[PDB]
Amino acid sequence: SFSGYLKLTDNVYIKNADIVEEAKKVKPTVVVNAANVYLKHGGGVAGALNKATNNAMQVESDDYIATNGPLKVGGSCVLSGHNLAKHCLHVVGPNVNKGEDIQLLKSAYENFNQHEVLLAPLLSAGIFGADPIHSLRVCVDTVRTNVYLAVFDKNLYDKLVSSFL
Numbered sequence: 001s002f003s004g005y006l007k008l009t010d011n012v013y014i015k016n017a018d019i020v021e022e023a024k025k026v027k028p029t030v031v032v033n034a035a036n037v038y039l040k041h042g043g044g045v046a047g048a049l050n051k052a053t054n055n056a057m058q059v060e061s062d063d064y065i066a067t068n069g070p071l072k073v074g075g076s077c078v079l080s081g082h083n084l085a086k087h088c089l090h091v092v093g094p095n096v097n098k099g100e101d102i103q104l105l106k107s108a109y110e111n112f113n114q115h116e117v118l119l120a121p122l123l124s125a126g127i128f129g130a131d132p133i134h135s136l137r138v139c140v141d142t143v144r145t146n147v148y149l150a151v152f153d154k155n156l157y158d159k160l161v162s163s164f165l
């Protein structure tokens with residue numbers, strides 16, 4: 001199962017790790033993707049997860065968008081996890097660098113509650129522009145299911161653990 005995670009709360013765990021390498025190792029039931037409404041997996045976690053699937057995740061995502069239209073900011077969809085997980089939960093956190101409502105971050109984390117255990121990144125962190133300390137706070141105050149957070153950046157991981165209330 002998941003190893004080397006620091007326990008933050010009864011249900012939230014965290015590790016300084018590459019989510020692609022973590023997914024390839026564990027092969028979780030659910031890996032969360034930090035998606036945009038168009039499921040265009042260009043950069044950040046999305047670009048990395050998609051590249052690990054040899055672009056199979058983008059091919060599948062484009063078929064999903066052609067059929068269903070775009071997701072909502074704060075929304076999600078369950079697609080295949082490919083070589084990374086059984087499923088990929090594509091969750092759209094608000095992108096602050098696109099003027100999107102940071103209040104949507106709680107709605108985005110609520111999607112995790114539909115899955116008993118998930119491997120996930122901090123929503124709206126990184127290239128999405130939100131404060132990762134705020135994202136972790138929203139995560140532990142919203143998610144009730146078991147969430148194993150992979151934080152790529154070592155220095156950010158240390159700051160998150162050392163500042164966690």
Ligand SMILES: NC(=O)C1=Cc2ccccc2OC1
Binds near residue numbers: 019020044152
């Ligand atoms: N496996 C990889 O190539 C990467 C992992 C990663 C992890 C988090 C965010 C962005 C990333 O981009 C590159």
